[PDB]
């Protein structure tokens, strides 16, 4: 009170000095069920992968994507992102994802990179300089390789001009190594552009087949259908907690509600446009949001020339939530309630007054 009044002497009276707050104890984040997962199982673990001149493009959209399972997998020998962060893939949202799946040689795994120049980069699969997304690559010597040699995986070796980014070329036009006329007829200086790889189990690391999936993100004016997973915690009721329900955040006591919502309605508002009712997204139940018991802390004292004894009034606060007496004005601590009636010395309110004789109310 001396701090509030900016004086070392306090006159007899009641002085509103502070503001009692029920401090929030927990944080409750409730987000709805993580269903309709993106089909990463049919892209990363498909039956047969495609070649690099005809890389398979899968469009990931209208689903929730769990990148934590993909990132925590130890089978992947290369996980390099060029426009995003691996630990923020579960937090960001994107419009759609392009998944480019192919098989290359182990020495060409570095060639799937922005600014990288190679045969696969120039003629088979090209990334832009402002590429966003992540390149994931893993060894597949136990699956793709055959003891007689797996010649099914082809790759383009020759082209007149370099690729544009995200451009396919499945054409089988005979390349002209020299300046002799070739009408599609092979000759001394005219060769077929698509050659087969030599994947065999006796080759070492570098010639083994590597399966590469490249995820590219689009952030156009389309709505961000692809988002990360939501980790909802348990629900705690009857306590002043910080609630986060489907992006609507606040602080309150979440109790059971008798308001029967219609099935399309999610939140509830009173006359004064304050959210007092809400629906939990996990379990379709209605919860009332009572504001925490804020109150004014008032100090009732006589003069400091008389005595240093004080009493504390917590306004609109029940006495079980803080010489303790319950008034309609609030809870009064430090004053002895008496059955006698005197004239009002220090007004408390609702017919209650305080006086010094100790402090009585």
């Amino acid at each position: 009170t001396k701090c509030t009044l900016k004086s070392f002497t306090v006159e007899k009276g009641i002085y509103q000095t502070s503001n009692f707050r029920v401090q929030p104890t927990e944080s409750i984040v409730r987000f709805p069920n993580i269903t309709n997962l993106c089909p990463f199982g049919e892209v990363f673990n498909a039956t047969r992968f495609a070649s690099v001149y005809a890389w398979n493009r899968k469009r990931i959209s209208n689903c929730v994507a769990d990148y934590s399972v993909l990132y925590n997998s130890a089978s992947f020998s290369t996980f390099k992102c060029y426009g995003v962060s691996p630990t923020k893939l579960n937090d960001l949202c994107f419009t759609n994802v392009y998944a480019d799946s192919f098989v290359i040689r182990g020495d060409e795994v570095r060639q799937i990179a922005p600014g990288q120049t190679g045969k696969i980069a120039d003629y088979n699969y090209k990334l832009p300089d402002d590429f966003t997304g992540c390149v994931i690559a893993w060894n597949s010597n136990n699956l793709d390789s055959k003891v007689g040699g797996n010649y099914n995986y082809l790759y383009r070796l020759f082209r007149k001009s370099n690729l544009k980014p995200f451009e396919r070329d499945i054409s089988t036009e005979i390349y002209q190594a020299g300046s002799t006329p070739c009408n599609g007829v092979e000759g001394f200086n005219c060769y077929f552009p698509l050659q087969s790889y030599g994947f065999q189990p006796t080759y070492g690391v570098g010639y083994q087949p590597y399966r590469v999936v490249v995820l590219s993100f689009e952030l156009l004016h389309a709505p961000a259908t692809v988002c990360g997973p939501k980790k909802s915690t348990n629900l705690v009721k009857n306590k002043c907690v910080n609630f986060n329900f489907n992006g609507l955040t606040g602080t309150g006591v979440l109790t059971e509600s008798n308001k029967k919502f219609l099935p399309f309605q999610q939140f509830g508002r009173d006359i004064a446009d304050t959210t007092d009712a809400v629906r939990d997204p996990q379990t379709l139940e209605i919860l009332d949001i009572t504001p925490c018991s804020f109150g004014g802390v008032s100090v009732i004292t006589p003069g400091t020339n008389t005595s240093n004894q004080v009493a504390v009034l917590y306004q609109d606060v029940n006495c079980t939530e803080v010489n303790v007496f319950q008034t309609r004005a609030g809870c009064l601590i430090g004053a002895e309630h008496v059955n006698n009636s005197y004239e009002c010395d220090i007004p408390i309110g609702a017919g209650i007054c305080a006086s010094y004789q100790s402090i009585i109310a």
Binding site: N62, H221, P223, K260, F261, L262, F264, Q266, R269, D270
Partner: protein, 254 residues
């Protein structure tokens, strides 16, 4: 497959009164026993709504401008109206939205379709005739859902294209009135929001033929247009909109 329908009878389109129809919930917020003033694309009260018939020989399937939103009212029996055609040029140059309800389910597709000039479905007296498109090239969004559906049924729909969101509001109403729109109040619940992200400026209803040439089953529908205005909505104790005030209709409601 496309078929020109050449046995139509020429008749000008009709017009009628909207009364107090076309109201929908502006948001997902419960409100109890309170009056809420809101500014949104609403259908004006007592407005001039365009009335189209299907009777035998009337078969009204034109292409209409979408404007800022579409109120579709349907005095329907035996389920003639099955879906809608949404787009800008309605050909393979642009990307179009297809809403269909066939005999099993509802299918929502966003693709590059080649629409026929006269698209329809058909019931033989068994549904065995689908002539609404000739091609489907580049699809971006597919969504299969649960079916939405004297004139016995009244179907109200509101279609909105706001920020790449397609809002479909709908209401089923049991009526027993013969010819025109009944006079009353019924707020339309939000049914489904679609992440389409496409330009739409024109639409077309999809009907169904009756074969036993073709015969048009008895149906009637109404097209109204959504305008930006203010409504004062009344929310009861149970939280349903029971009455509304159009703030720009007359000075009393102002």
């Amino acid at each position: 497959q496309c078929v020109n329908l050449t046995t139509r009878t020429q008749l000008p389109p009709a017009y009628t009164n909207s009364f107090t129809r076309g109201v929908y919930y502006p948001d997902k917020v419960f409100r109890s026993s309170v009056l809420h003033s809101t500014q949104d694309l609403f259908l004006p009260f007592f407005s001039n709504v365009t009335w189209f018939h299907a009777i035998h020989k009337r078969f009204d399937n034109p292409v209409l401008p979408f404007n800022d939103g579409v109120y579709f009212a349907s005095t329907e029996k035996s389920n003639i109206i099955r879906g809608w055609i949404f787009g800008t040029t309605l050909d393979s140059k642009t990307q179009s939205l297809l809403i269909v309800n066939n005999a099993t389910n509802v299918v929502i597709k966003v693709c590059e379709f080649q629409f026929c000039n006269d698209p329809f479905l058909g019931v033989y007296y068994m549904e065995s005739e689908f002539r609404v498109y000739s091609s489907a090239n580049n699809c971006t969004f597919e969504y299969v859902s649960q079916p939405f559906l004297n004139f016995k049924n009244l179907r109200e729909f509101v279609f909105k294209n706001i920020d790449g969101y397609f809002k479909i509001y709908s209401k089923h109403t049991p009526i027993n009135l013969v010819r025109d729109l009944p006079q009353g109040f019924s707020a339309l619940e939000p049914l489904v929001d679609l992440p389409i992200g496409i330009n739409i400026t024109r639409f077309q209803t999809l009907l169904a033929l009756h074969r036993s040439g073709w015969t048009a089953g008895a149906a009637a529908y109404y097209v109204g247009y959504l305008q930006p205005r203010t409504f004062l909505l009344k929310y009861n104790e149970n939280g349903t909109i029971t009455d509304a005030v159009d703030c720009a209709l007359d000075p009393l409601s102002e």
